[PDB]
Design a binder for this molecule. Structure first.
Ligand SMILES: NC(=O)c1ccc[n+]([C@@H]2O[C@H](COP(=O)([O-])OP(=O)(O)OC[C@H]3O[C@@H](n4cnc5c(N)ncnc54)[C@H](O)[C@@H]3O)[C@@H](O)[C@H]2O)c1
Ligand SMILES: NC(=O)c1ccc[n+]([C@@H]2O[C@H](COP(=O)([O-])OP(=O)(O)OC[C@H]3O[C@@H](n4cnc5c(N)ncnc54)[C@H](O)[C@@H]3O)[C@@H](O)[C@H]2O)c1
Ligand SMILES: NC(=O)c1ccc[n+]([C@@H]2O[C@H](COP(=O)([O-])OP(=O)(O)OC[C@H]3O[C@@H](n4cnc5c(N)ncnc54)[C@H](O)[C@@H]3O)[C@@H](O)[C@H]2O)c1
Ligand SMILES: NC(=O)c1ccc[n+]([C@@H]2O[C@H](COP(=O)([O-])OP(=O)(O)OC[C@H]3O[C@@H](n4cnc5c(N)ncnc54)[C@H](O)[C@@H]3O)[C@@H](O)[C@H]2O)c1
Ligand SMILES: Nc1nc2c(ncn2[C@@H]2O[C@H](COP(=O)(O)OP(=O)(O)O)[C@@H](O)[C@H]2O)c(=O)[nH]1
Ligand SMILES: Nc1nc2c(ncn2[C@@H]2O[C@H](COP(=O)(O)OP(=O)(O)O)[C@@H](O)[C@H]2O)c(=O)[nH]1
Ligand SMILES: Nc1nc2c(ncn2[C@@H]2O[C@H](COP(=O)(O)OP(=O)(O)O)[C@@H](O)[C@H]2O)c(=O)[nH]1
Ligand SMILES: Nc1nc2c(ncn2[C@@H]2O[C@H](COP(=O)(O)OP(=O)(O)O)[C@@H](O)[C@H]2O)c(=O)[nH]1
Lengths: 342, 342, 346, 343
């Protein structure tokens, strides 16, 4: 049984590889562009060099011919489509590449599968990763469900609305075993440095090592996020893929997935500062270049639909996930891998 | 005062240029790719050649640099963005170009305007044309209004969903005077041959001239729609454009726009056969190559929101619109411009 | 269950592809597939509509050069034995200000076609003959008084020129790398009654026809007249494409071989205007004016040819006189205006 | 203070051009990158960048025209080092569309933005368009390449630099934009990407030394000739050309071949890397199918007379030290647990 991971070098993809190698007998294929950063997969290199259950396929979301070669030659039984331009902030000023990679990237994958299904009966389970950002700037005091209206908060958000409709459409039109996951915040030690809890943790680490004045730079703190560790999120994807295989997930079925621990962003900063010998002496300053034209600033979740379909809960406390992320930046700086403060 | 029409060579765009020339003192710019069909605009060639109030700008939806030159050099005061891959049936097998031209083409326009507004205060009214097709296979019995949830019935439908959220987003994010129109079926003598009422009118005219056996080939008829002549639709667009300029349409506001008259598809056929001397002798046959993986179905009746912002109603009878279209195909065959039966 | 040699024409709705379809139906036993985007102008193919409705030897496949998935479907489902790849943004002048779509459609479009073929060859042994249509504009602004041959240095005179250099190298590369039976044709000017209105000899004939019919002042608007072109009727060019296609099938044309192809008759642009004016009763009374908007940042202003390579591989010369090609084009525009299909004067 | 833009700032050459400009000029430096690109080559710059000391970052993608528009409009660099590309021929074969898009259209996206700004406002930057000796593809044996050598399409990458090269010349000739085009040989050293021949040989030796690989180096075609120089010599050539162009001594769109003095058959490069290793005499070399190419640009020997006639320049760094620096880089990475793929 063969699993393809798109976005293998990313936060979630690299951890899905780890999870599948430790918890299944699956062969794993990691899709990447050849020059993608190795930071998340260095621990997998020897195993890949040894051809022990995991291999790399070189393909770009934006090269349909590369994806054709991948599906024709590898025929993955299950696909975790995690590859995307994942960052809303750059999507404002680089919106064309965000729309191309996320919407057209996903159409390039799904159309490749559709044609191979018509020709040869290829019938893979296809995980299409959407985002809770399809709900953009959601009304306060209400929890999100799978029928909550979509709001375009950013080109990234619109790109994920596109990804989402494509996932549902290809399932509904061609009976491909797609399911769509509208994820809240999933984080932990491999969270990209640009995301809120990771830039806060990283700036604390920079401050502790004397690289930055003891002022954390932030954007809008009037925002509510639900967190869980990727190690929990990934189990939900694996458990959904099994149900999809067994016939229990309708083609194109959508699911909101999040943790149970929700925070106003000042509470996350306070948790991270409490892990620092010098937290009592570190201030916070809102700066203009971290603000957004529209902020999707409220993500609270009713998880009743997902828990009705799989037997799953988040096990890792959010304080441990955050501590892991702070130690990660501490370790990078100690080793001379000085990050941007961004 | 200068008006840009994207999709100038198309059904609606060509008729919008006629409306503005007859009813306003506006200078008119028609955007086109140089090789576009001239069928809808032969009657404007003379006055274009003579530089009388209308001019052509050569640009492509997929060439940002061509749109950059358009907005910088011409600075239209109002923009009717009608250019699209308009046909759902081809969108199934040519999905990438539908998504690229419709979503990214719209993003190319809106990001060009955005940057010009930030640099020089350029503040045009921007009609972003979406479609009732965003509602796709609508939930039987829910009242259909501007807050009904979208459904992705085709790559076309998803591309107009994309277009819709781009229009909304660029309005909300950057205070660009966008408004989004979700129009029901508009038709009349310039309806492209491929659309339902056009292919039926066209096949009847082929049968009346002995080019086809007296069998009309159709797809699914278990569909109900509102119809309006384009010349009514254009009035609604024009009147909205005035309200947007006056400050009365919030940036990014969306509007469903339905005709007065609703029909089952067999009833549209019955109206067309009754304009034929040989109507009593023509069979209708459903064939597979006209069937769609998903067939959209919505009763979009409720115009209470558009009627609240403009003094407007469809005035032209649908029977006259369908007769005009049948006569168009009769005239085309009579001139030896024999169309495909498609 | 009767199986025929199948020809695909990309650019079926264009000047050359429309005439290639006519040629194959009259002179061969081939089934013809016309590739088009559905909304493409019908002007050049109205006379085929009845035949196509009747499923008599010619069909339409809807695909876009920029939609790889659409081409995959076309090659997988139809497996044409021979491909005339004529589809392009064909016009240098618009390429200056719409350069990205010119580069995407011509270079990436051609790459989408060839990569689809490469993959079907490796999997299933699909081995079509592939005509990759390039342009003498690969030589851009060539040194004056010298004949072009196939080893003449390339020059980038426009985004269109660079797109056809890209198209040309892709044609040679897929041939040399994967043993796809490509050949590349670097054509001079081929014209006649379906020449698009924007090209020199077409705009000049169109303007004369507008003047005769009372739609224009007796001034023809032109750009740079210090330019040399070699002309042949498309009806002669398509014969060369056909005969080269048979030689590729036969193993006589190495994968990715390039050929310059052009007519016998070369002219300075004013001579072309005088030939067309001499076909008009209004001809002695019409002035010629250079206007800024028909000028170009760089003009590929010299195209004369050593045709020795193509004539050594096929038994072929242009037979239609250019005066007859030009007369047919003027009569086309007269007919168009008579029928109320009033063109732009562009 | 003069403003320099580097595209491909995170790459082998861009990152070293930033080092070179900071050390040798009073130029403000702008590094273009997509936000997620590898930090490997620029970690040593993060603190400078954080403290806004002469170097900054602008987020743009070659394939997003609007992002490049914001860059030239807002930042108006006086000099541009266009080094960003899909740089690798091997992946270009099976990922050809992205190579063509990023390299040809990416360059068009840059040059068209500059054209429109020059027309409107008189923006007149110097524009280094980096091409490749691979425009000459599979060249004739026994003959040096020069600027008039016939072009040959050896790979989608090769064709993508042919496109890039013609765009460089065209935008210069058509619009009098101060472009120059550089068709480089092999420039290498410690930041050389792991997939390239001398970097994969040197990396595989390091994996063998540290016990991560059997003592067999996997290679492709060894019947190939290359001319090497250290990137620290190449970047000096680009800089000197940028001064000449600013003075008005480089015709708009002028092309230059640039390469070092030291040429080698590939086996000779392997033998120099093995002699740096205590395990040298013990390691086999095995040609493998998955490193072979449909066409190989087999032969890169250079006539450098044109470049030496326009700037006062030659390669100074011996290629032996260049390869030593590369081998020691892969030793350090492995010793620090940054275990590379063996590809
Ligand atoms: N982690 C979260 O909190 C969160 C929230 C909601 C949704 N998601 C979604 O989950 C998925 C994975 O998130 P992540 O945190 O791992 O993101 P990430 O940024 O860490 O990883 C993105 C991956 O996509 C790859 N990629 C980008 N462009 C590509 C292209 N053109 N071709 C091929 N690969 C390309 C990158 O190289 C990388 O491996 C994404 O779709 C993201 O939008 C994440
Ligand atoms: N008429 C209806 O029933 C209806 C219903 C809902 C929405 N709409 C929307 O109304 C608009 C106009 O409809 P129509 O009937 O006139 O369609 P049409 O097909 O007649 O017009 C399409 C136009 O877009 C242009 N276009 C296509 N691709 C282009 C590109 N790459 N660059 C530039 N121009 C390009 C075409 O040349 C043509 O002018 C479309 O956006 C359509 O989706 C129409
Ligand atoms: N006729 C000449 O004098 C001449 C000279 C040298 C080169 N050529 C080349 O010969 C070929 C044919 O010339 P022509 O006069 O017939 O050109 P044309 O402009 O009449 O036709 C071009 C064709 O390409 C199609 N096309 C354009 N973009 C497309 C896309 N995105 N997807 C699908 N189809 C698309 C058009 O619809 C049309 O059918 C072209 O490649 C042209 O560059 C012609
Ligand atoms: N080093 C050599 O031996 C050599 C030889 C001849 C030519 N060249 C050319 O010199 C230049 C620099 O080479 P290098 O060794 O530094 O290459 P590299 O692979 O080390 O660097 C490539 C750079 O381009 C960037 N890039 C890739 N795609 C991008 C995109 N879509 N948007 C923005 N940036 C993108 C990468 O992120 C990276 O910064 C390239 O143009 C290369 O083709 C190199
Ligand atoms: N990335 C980022 N987000 C911030 C910052 N300060 C506040 N935020 C907010 O943190 C929330 C989450 O942002 P982010 O981590 O980028 O992930 P998102 O959920 O994908 O937008 C948003 O409401 C941001 O506006 C900051 O400095 N960086
Ligand atoms: N185009 C087309 N549509 C048909 C045909 N027969 C039935 N229909 C249906 O008529 C409805 C209108 O389709 P169409 O005219 O293509 O417009 P759209 O789908 O609203 O853009 C859809 O439900 C079609 O599936 C036909 O022969 N052609
Ligand atoms: N299209 C066009 N070309 C013109 C005109 N006047 C002169 N030319 C020149 O005629 C030559 C041929 O141009 P054109 O017909 O576009 O074909 P091409 O440039 O060879 O593809 C070029 O040298 C043009 O500069 C004109 O009015 N229209
Ligand atoms: N990258 C790479 N190239 C190899 C290998 N074995 C031989 N070569 C040859 O080494 C030469 C240089 O290739 P490369 O370093 O990829 O740089 P290029 O000059 O950009 O193709 C080419 O002739 C390759 O065919 C190998 O294992 N990896």
């Amino acid at each position: 049984k063969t699993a393809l991971i798109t976005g293998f070098t990313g936060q979630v993809g690299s951890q899905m590889a780890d999870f599948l190698l430790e918890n299944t007998d699956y062969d794993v294929i990691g899709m990447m562009r050849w020059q993608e950063p190795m930071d998340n997969i260095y621990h997998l290199s020897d195993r890949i060099n040894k051809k022990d259950r995991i291999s790399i396929f070189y393909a770009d979301l934006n090269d349909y011919s590369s994806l054709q070669k991948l599906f024709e030659s590898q025929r993955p039984d299950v696909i975790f489509h995690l590859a995307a331009q994942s960052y809303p902030k750059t999507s404002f000023d680089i919106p064309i590449e965000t729309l191309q990679t996320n919407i057209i990237g996903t159409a390039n994958i799904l159309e490749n599968i559709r044609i191979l299904k018509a020709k040869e009966g290829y019938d893979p389970v296809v995980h299409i990763c959407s985002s809770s950002e399809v709900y953009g700037k959601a009304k306060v005091g209400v929890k999100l469900n799978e029928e909550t209206a979509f709001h375009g908060a950013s080109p990234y958000s619109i790109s994920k609305i596109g990804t989402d409709y494509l996932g549902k459409f290809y399932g509904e039109a061609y009976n491909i075993r797609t399911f769509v996951t509208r994820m809240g915040t999933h984080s932990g030690p491999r969270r990209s440095d640009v995301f809120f809890e990771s830039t806060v943790a990283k700036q604390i680490a920079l401050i502790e090592a004397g690289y930055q004045e003891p002022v954390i730079k932030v954007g809008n703190l009037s925002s509510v996020r639900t967190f869980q560790d990727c190690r929990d999120a990934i189990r939900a994807y694996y458990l959904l893929s099994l149900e999809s295989e067994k016939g229990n997930i309708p083609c194109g079925e959508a699911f909101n997935i999040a943790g149970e621990e929700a925070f106003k962003l000042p509470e996350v900063i306070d948790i991270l500062l409490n892990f620092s010998d010098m937290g009592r002496g570190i201030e916070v300053r809102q700066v203009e270049d971290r603000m957004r034209p529209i902020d999707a600033d409220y993500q609270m979740f009713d998880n009743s639909k997902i828990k009705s379909f799989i037997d799953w809960k988040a096990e890792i406390p959010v304080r441990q996930m955050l501590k892991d992320l702070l130690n990660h930046w501490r370790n990078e700086i100690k080793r001379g891998r000085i990050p941007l403060n961004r």
